[PDB]
Assembly symmetry: D2
Amino acid sequence: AGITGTWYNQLGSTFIVTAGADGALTGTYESAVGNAESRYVLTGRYDSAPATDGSGTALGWTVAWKNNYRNAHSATTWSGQYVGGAEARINTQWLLTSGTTEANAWKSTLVGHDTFTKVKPS
Amino acid sequence: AGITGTWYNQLGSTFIVTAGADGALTGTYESAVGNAESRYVLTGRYDSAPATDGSGTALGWTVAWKNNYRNAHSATTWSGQYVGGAEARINTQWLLTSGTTEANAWKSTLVGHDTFTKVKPS
Amino acid sequence: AGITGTWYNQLGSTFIVTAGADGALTGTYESAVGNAESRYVLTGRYDSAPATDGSGTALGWTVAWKNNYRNAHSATTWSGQYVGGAEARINTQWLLTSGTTEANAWKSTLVGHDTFTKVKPS
Amino acid sequence: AGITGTWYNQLGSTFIVTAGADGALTGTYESAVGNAESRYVLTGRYDSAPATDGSGTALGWTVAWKNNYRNAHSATTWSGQYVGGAEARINTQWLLTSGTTEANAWKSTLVGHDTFTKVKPS
């Protein structure tokens, strides 16, 4: 169950999350950490029964940079895997797609990565 | 609203989906198209108010290759953007992460793409 | 076994390439195609000895977007595979990275895909 | 402005590279580091004239995983940027593509990240 919680990224984002018994992910993303109108609904999925081999626990989740206060006309999906214990992290790769005229399709999707930890950076 | 529906991919996958008035995505992924125990719950997010410039409509969604019948200990997040009209498509990039020993972390995430259309391929 | 030549992608860009007998790839890439002021240097590598089970031929290459007529301050790589036959295609995927101040480092790399064909698109 | 040299990543791999005065990149990459049987050819490009606003230096390169001692039937490219200073790092991202039959074409390309530093990791 050790997914549910708060999770901080190197750069200064934060999201708390729940893991539905069945296998859901519900939460909200805070893209600063001292903000309020800069939170966005979070939903995603994670393998609710993982393997017995020290192997990761696959997950993903999406967040749409639009809320009741702002719209970036964009959305990030985080894909990766959660590891547990004392050094416990959420290792992801992420994609970011904006809405584009088809003229600029080709340049619509930023790629990156993010390591989330259960205790703040610096 | 022209997201809700069925969507087919070049290769032979299918997913029907709803767009919550607010901005959610709920659905289920069929990874063949004539299957049944090979469907997986689908949830994700999409910009419920898009821009007025012919620009795409950003979205993403995640699917965990584990259900009541199978487990691939994996998960795909699809990120991209939906375009409408008579030639209407869901253009995405996708990531796939498996659970890995940390020994094999480095090789945990397949990258690809998928163009979804509202009417079957071949 | 005919990587050597001229190739074209979904949007009418072109790169010519000789395929050194070991893995060398060198040649060029032309933003558009009919123009000498928008031409760019290209080097890369490929498997000079692919398996015989009709498996693709892995390859990669690079086009720092700099010449004597423009500097874009950026570089694309292309990773993927050659699949000869009637319809010879170089199915690839690419990462486009610009040079950023440390703060924009995160929005630095586009991701995308590209099919190349020995015949011009539409 | 010191791309030329020896670099190391989070897992103790290494590549040496000369940075041609225009953009050439050539050199090598060593699966591990202390071994001649696991060494691989490397070519690429970089912006030989990056802007002066302390922006990174874009670059890319390729290592078809083939030598006289092993053939992996695959190729990685590395796209990213050089950021000199006290802590000079080449922050990159990479795509690892194997040669596949048309049916496995979809599970063909790993994606991932890599920091390189002029000093060995741990």
